[PDB]
User: Fold Translation initiation factor 1A from Pyrococcus abyssi.
Amino acid sequence: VIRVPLPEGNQLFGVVEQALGAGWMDVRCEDGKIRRCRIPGKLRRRVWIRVGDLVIVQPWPVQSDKRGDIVYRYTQTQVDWLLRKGKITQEFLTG
RNA sequence: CGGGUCGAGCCUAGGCUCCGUGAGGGGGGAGAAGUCGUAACAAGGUAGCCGUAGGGGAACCUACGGCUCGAUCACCUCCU
Ligand SMILES: [Mg+2]
Ligand SMILES: [Mg+2]
Ligand SMILES: [Mg+2]
Assistant:
């Protein structure tokens, strides 16, 4: 079929509202809480993360409130390709 | 029982000091995929810096008197 990072293991999905900066990414997840993410040492070179962008993140189990870690960003090729299959519906990005 | 005298302890009021919490405030140090400019370094595009005073979102701008730890050309002056 295809190779995409689905929710496999303990991943999350991350769509930020506004970046406070300095690494911390502020995401409006549908988990319920306001979450704040940080970046590992491999992806601060080739890519670009902005508000209006959907990515997959990975949390740590602490406090289930403010978690997340960037492990993969989504391209203009797959962001809306993950729509018809309904793995995410876009009613949680503007309303 | 009376007389004198040594006395720790206790109370009240006044002068100083120590310590755990502290509404509100102020700078300091690490973090650098947040923001606004370009002040320094070449004559860094207005030469840079010291003292004192006024001004400005912020680096900073201006006035008077000093220094060279200032670049280029032309003419002098003083030497080797
Ligand atoms: Mg400058
Ligand atoms: Mg200048
Ligand atoms: Mg003098």
